[PDB]
Amino acid sequence: HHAADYVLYKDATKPVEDRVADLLGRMTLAEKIGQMTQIERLVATPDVLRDNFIGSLLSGGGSVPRKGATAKEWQDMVDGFQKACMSTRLGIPMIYGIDAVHGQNNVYGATIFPHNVGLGATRDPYLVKRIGEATALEVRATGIQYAFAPCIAVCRDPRWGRCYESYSEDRRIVQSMTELIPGLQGDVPKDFTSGMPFVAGKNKVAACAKHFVGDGGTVDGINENNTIINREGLMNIHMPAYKNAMDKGVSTVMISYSSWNGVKMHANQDLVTGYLKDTLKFKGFVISDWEGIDRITTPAGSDYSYSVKASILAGLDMIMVPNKYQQFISILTGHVNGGVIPMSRIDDAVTRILRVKFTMGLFENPYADPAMAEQLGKQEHRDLAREAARKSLVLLKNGKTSTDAPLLPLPKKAPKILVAGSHADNLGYQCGGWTIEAQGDTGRTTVGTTILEAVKAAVDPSTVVVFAENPDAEFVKSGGFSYAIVAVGEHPYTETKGDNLNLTIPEPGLSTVQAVCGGVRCATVLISGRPVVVQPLLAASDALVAAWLPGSEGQGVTDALFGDFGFTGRLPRTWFKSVDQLPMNVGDAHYDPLFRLGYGLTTNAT
Ligand SMILES: CO[C@@H]1O[C@H](CS[C@@H]2O[C@H](CO)[C@@H](O)[C@H](O)[C@H]2O)[C@@H](O)[C@H](O)[C@H]1O
């Protein structure tokens, strides 16, 4: 179609499939295997990206150009990498991926939304869609086009260190929250074929349904372990939300480190090719987890030649290497050269990668938009996060006896009030994991409002607010306080570091609640990624709120405490009496919860 040096794949007016086929048919083996290779920014240079025809980059948790980097610094980094990729013979743009799983959370100044478990407590799929929309804008503010979200794990045991990344133990809730996908990517058109990838354009991002499949079903909640369940249970609990994701055009799917009945997901041809591709008709690309292919073997990495063979034959399309690209490319090239992996398999992987890139507009807008930088941390997005935080809160108790005056909502005007606890003024703790670092961190790690700051912003000017992190009983009795707000809970974690067999919060936590509540009426705000042993906290407290990991906008907490809005959140998970009961989920035979899934007290707004 017209000029003498015309190249069909570069023509934006042509159908995606025609562009894919046109480009595929010109590519060398090295160019093909390049597309299948994703590397860490930490090992990328312009020559590396050119010379190896690299298809994708990522930032793993905490992989940042520098601490405190501006949106523009991120854009310039991504563009620098893209410039090298566009300078190859075929000029295939790279796609840059990142864990934007509760906002653009590796980035300083990014709006941090509540983690998934709290979003499940909202029962508000449209809220979650709007969070996807806002997150896409903040990811594109940093020049990034691809988010490794949503985690649609159905966490069946809260001892798992990633349970907070699951909307619920009930697959129906997880299914409802797949609305994140069209928020991130845009709504699919009227006549859309389930399983096709979709991204609307340069103001949206490619999404990733992860981790396929049964990541939330592992024995004793051990991260990356074995999920022992028959096909019927796999298909009834862990699979359904993947079909919803297909219906909404999710662009990519990431494979789980976990195994199903002893078979590594990263080597499972029956599930990856037979089910996801051949039965659900998924036409986007399948990506490994981080060194996921390495971990097929025991020990990990002990037969990388086998890792590459098993994974690519299983049907994986792009490998998150993420460091040893030379070895990955060398081994896969050798396998193809020796007939161990057929060209049909390579061509399928590349067809899928290119399909996603053409569909999302990446060949038309390979570079960042500097006018998008100002989307980072935008007040409109913080207002949305604040709404979500407030809606996520589950009121578990509001009075020690049925005859007591309800403590909540608290009055904004009082002569003197106490704010206490390890989690009352610690932004990192209220954000939890996947915030600035993978494991999260402590203290003022980004821009936000702590619970203490939110209290001070809310109360009448005449109200004196005293902070004490861990006051003793005498301090509280002597203080002339009208009431106290005390916040305690879990420290930030992810993955295996979060795996926890006892689920009791660190001290001082309980001891501070006991000291405060022993001296004055108290509302305890429990910050956690999951249910934790709570009877002792309940016994001490007049009121208690499960606030989960509410993110940067602590005013969400105080919006409910002071009655600007009523409490509406409902448990998205069973609250156990004892860890000895676990696993224990709604619908089980022996179901003996402290609080059943769906439980939540309410209040009315003042
Ligand atoms: C800094 O990168 C590494 O992060 C991983 C987290 S594990 C794996 O990582 C993917 C890419 O960030 C995620 O999309 C996926 O959900 C995770 O399962 C960790 O293993 C390393 O500690 C860390 O260096």
Side-chain angles (χ1 to χ4, degrees):
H1 267 235
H2 286 219
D5 68 341
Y6 176 78
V7 169
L8 191 150
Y9 77 86
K10 295 182 163 169
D11 183 344
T13 69
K14 290 283 157 163
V16 164
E17 301 303 310
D18 296 343
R19 298 179 75 185
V20 172
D22 185 74
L23 172 55
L24 185 62
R26 300 168 189 264
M27 292 171 74
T28 68
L29 179 60
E31 285 164 341
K32 286 175 188 186
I33 286 166
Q35 283 303 295
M36 299 172 66
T37 307
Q38 181 182 79
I39 72 176
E40 244 285 349
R41 54 160 286 278
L42 290 164
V43 302
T45 67
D47 286 330
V48 161
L49 295 169
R50 268 178 210 113
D51 294 347
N52 302 282
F53 304 106
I54 294 302
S56 180
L57 286 89
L58 86 152
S59 281
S63 182
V64 305
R66 58 169 193 156
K67 292 309 282 276
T70 65
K72 178 189 186 314
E73 289 178 65
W74 281 92
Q75 294 200 179
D76 289 345
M77 180 192 66
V78 182
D79 283 344
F81 293 142
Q82 191 68 284
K83 197 80 200 287
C85 296
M86 296 299 290
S87 76
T88 63
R89 183 181 80 102
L90 301 173
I92 304 172
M94 65 82 212
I95 185 171
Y96 197 112
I98 199 163
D99 296 285
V101 298
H102 64 145
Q104 172 55 147
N105 52 71
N106 285 122
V107 178
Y108 188 84
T111 304
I112 306 297
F113 295 91
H115 273 299
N116 284 177
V117 61
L119 300 183
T122 73
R123 304 295 199 283
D124 192 339
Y126 184 53
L127 172 75
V128 173
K129 188 183 183 181
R130 293 144 60 206
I131 292 173
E133 296 175 343
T135 299
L137 294 175
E138 303 207 12
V139 174
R140 285 286 193 164
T142 66
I144 293 169
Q145 319 96 340
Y146 177 28
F148 300 132
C151 182
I152 58 166
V154 184
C155 170
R156 302 293 287 177
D157 196 322
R159 294 172 292 178
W160 191 32
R162 313 191 74 168
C163 206
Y164 65 86
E165 296 199 74
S166 180
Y167 302 103
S168 182
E169 75 196 33
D170 184 348
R171 60 95 187 179
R172 301 169 190 78
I173 294 169
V174 174
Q175 281 180 108
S176 77
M177 307 301 194
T178 56
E179 284 300 281
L180 191 83
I181 291 162
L184 287 166
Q185 297 192 323
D187 289 310
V188 303
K190 25 263 152 269
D191 57 331
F192 187 73
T193 303
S194 178
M196 289 291 282
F198 183 78
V199 178
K202 70 188 184 168
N203 301 127
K204 297 290 190 181
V205 302
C208 181
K210 75 188 193 179
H211 316 79
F212 181 85
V213 57
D215 51 340
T218 61
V219 169
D220 295 339
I222 298 155
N223 189 219
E224 313 192 10
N225 212 255
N226 198 15
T227 293
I228 297 158
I229 193 167
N230 64 12
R231 190 176 190 279
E232 173 167 347
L234 187 76
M235 296 295 181
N236 180 51
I237 295 171
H238 292 109
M239 193 64 80
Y242 283 94
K243 172 64 157 65
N244 300 80
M246 303 296 96
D247 289 349
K248 297 170 189 193
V250 76
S251 289
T252 73
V253 169
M254 184 183 300
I255 306 307
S256 184
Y257 289 127
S258 58
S259 296
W260 177 47
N261 297 325
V263 175
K264 293 273 172 181
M265 282 309 315
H266 283 251
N268 195 325
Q269 194 183 260
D270 288 351
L271 285 180
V272 178
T273 298
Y275 201 74
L276 175 57
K277 294 182 170 191
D278 293 358
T279 306
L280 302 180
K281 305 306 186 183
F282 181 57
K283 301 296 186 199
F285 75 80
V286 174
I287 187 171
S288 84
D289 208 334
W290 173 284
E291 304 171 339
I293 75 172
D294 310 51
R295 296 181 205 178
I296 287 163
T297 66
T298 304
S302 71
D303 189 348
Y304 199 62
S305 173
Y306 177 72
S307 291
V308 175
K309 175 178 136 164
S311 65
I312 298 308
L313 292 176
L316 279 74
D317 305 308
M318 181 183 293
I319 302 302
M320 183 180 303
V321 183
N323 299 321
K324 279 298 309 92
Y325 55 84
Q326 185 196 290
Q327 191 191 12
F328 172 73
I329 291 163
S330 187
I331 287 173
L332 181 50
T333 302
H335 281 152
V336 174
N337 283 341
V340 171
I341 293 167
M343 192 65 35
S344 63
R345 189 64 272 288
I346 302 300
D347 284 354
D348 173 63
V350 178
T351 291
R352 289 161 176 280
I353 292 166
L354 294 183
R355 184 178 293 118
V356 169
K357 295 181 167 189
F358 282 118
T359 299
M360 72 190 293
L362 192 68
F363 286 71
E364 277 61 74
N365 287 275
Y367 301 106
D369 181 357
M372 294 290 283
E374 56 196 277
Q375 296 289 333
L376 194 69
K378 223 174 67 195
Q379 191 58 41
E380 295 90 331
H381 307 340
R382 295 182 187 282
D383 294 344
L384 174 62
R386 171 177 177 175
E387 176 189 347
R390 174 253 302 177
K391 290 178 164 183
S392 76
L393 311 173
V394 180
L395 182 61
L396 296 180
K397 182 184 182 171
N398 194 194
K400 301 191 171 168
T401 81
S402 71
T403 189
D404 285 15
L407 182 62
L408 305 180
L410 299 162
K412 296 175 183 186
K413 185 170 169 178
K416 189 171 173 190
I417 66 173
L418 177 63
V419 176
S422 58
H423 290 58
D425 192 39
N426 186 324
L427 190 59
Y429 282 11
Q430 74 182 53
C431 292
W434 291 109
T435 312
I436 306 304
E437 297 289 347
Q439 291 296 323
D441 202 359
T442 184
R444 182 150 249 86
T445 57
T446 187
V447 176
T449 302
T450 63
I451 290 166
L452 171 63
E453 291 165 341
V455 171
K456 293 175 181 188
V459 294
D460 189 87
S462 74
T463 299
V464 175
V465 180
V466 177
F467 174 65
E469 186 172 334
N470 191 200
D472 68 17
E474 177 186 341
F475 177 96
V476 182
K477 288 182 226 302
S478 290
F481 297 117
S482 296
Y483 54 81
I485 295 161
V486 61
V488 296
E490 298 195 298
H491 293 172
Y493 55 82
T494 349
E495 297 142 19
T496 309
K497 284 177 187 164
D499 289 354
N500 183 328
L501 296 179
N502 59 75
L503 300 184
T504 71
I505 64 168
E507 288 308 293
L510 177 64
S511 60
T512 297
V513 169
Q514 290 170 334
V516 173
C517 302
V520 74
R521 72 204 187 106
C522 71
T524 296
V525 178
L526 175 59
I527 296 288
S528 68
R530 55 185 158 199
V532 292
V533 176
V534 80
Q535 295 97 323
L537 287 169
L538 285 168
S541 300
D542 300 88
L544 192 143
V545 175
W548 315 109
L549 303 173
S552 60
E553 305 316 310
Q555 290 168 108
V557 179
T558 51
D559 285 349
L561 293 179
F562 292 112
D564 286 345
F565 296 88
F567 281 91
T568 54
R570 296 172 73 230
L571 291 183
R573 289 205 69 74
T574 292
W575 210 296
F576 55 82
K577 290 184 176 173
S578 160
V579 299
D580 296 349
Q581 303 178 291
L582 300 176
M584 187 180 70
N585 300 279
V586 241
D588 284 359
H590 94 294
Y591 198 58
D592 185 23
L594 186 69
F595 303 102
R596 57 170 251 281
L597 184 145
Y599 178 91
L601 306 182
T602 60
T603 56
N604 296 328
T606 323

